[PDB]
Amino acid sequence: MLVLVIGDFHVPHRSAAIPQVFLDRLNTGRIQTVLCTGNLCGKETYDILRTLAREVHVVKGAFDEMQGLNETEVIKIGNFKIGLMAGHQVIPWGDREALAIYQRQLDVDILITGHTHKLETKEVGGKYFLNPGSATGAYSPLVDNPVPSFMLLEINDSELTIYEYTLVDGSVKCERVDFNK
């Protein structure tokens, strides 16, 4: 049921740390599956994703030199087919129609991309487009003030619940989005 949607950890030549509050929340809550959009801070980040959940899925990010990571993956959870990728490849970058075209080629009910460094939950034509933001608040040319953020999905059968965690002004804030079928 519980799925961790995370990504965009590292930007080259820039340092950004995962908020300690996020790591404490994520290890105890028990995570069934992890979907990571990429751009990891090396092996240290992968060790963090591997301990919090048993099933980890990582896609190839633009700054990812890790060998063996596929650029696009498809995961089936409940009655939802989910495809994850970095999202720097969709052009013109975060475009609603560009992302919608990608969702068709994957034939997925949920499409998870992460390149804009801005968390966003959105529904288009019965499809769900998720973006967990940057969990380290990493620098991006697209957002002037990015905040650290992740997503935890509660997916049972065909019911989809999304918990949006962000860190604003040193204070965590979380928003719940409820979707059915």
CATH number at residue 162: 3.60.21.10
Give the C-alpha separation, 31 to 8, whole Å.
19
Number of other CB atoms surrounding residue 170 within 10 Å: 7
Give the C-alpha separation, 96 to 40, whole Å.
26
Give the C-alpha separation, 2 to 26, whole Å.
11
Give the C-alpha separation, 142 to 158, whole Å.
33
Reduce the DSSP state of residue 106 to 3 states and report it. Answer: helix
The two three-digit tokens of residue 26, written as one number:
């994520």
Give the C-alpha separation, 59 to 118, whole Å.
18
Q: How many domains does the chain have?
A: 1
Report which DSSP code applies to 109.
Answer: S
**Residue with token string 């959940």:** 53
Q: Give the pairing type, strands 159-168 and 171-180.
A: antiparallel
Give the C-alpha separation, 113 to 132, whole Å.
8
Sign of CA dihedral 88, 92, 93, 97: negative
Number of other CB atoms surrounding residue 68 within 10 Å: 6
Give the C-alpha separation, 27 to 130, whole Å.
22
DSSP states of 111-163: EE---SS--EEEEETTEEEEE---TT----SS-SS---EEEEEEEETTEEEEE
The two three-digit tokens of residue 76, written as one number:
């089936």
Method by which this entry was solved: X-ray
Question: Range of 15's domain?
Answer: 1-181
Give the C-alpha separation, 2 to 53, whole Å.
10
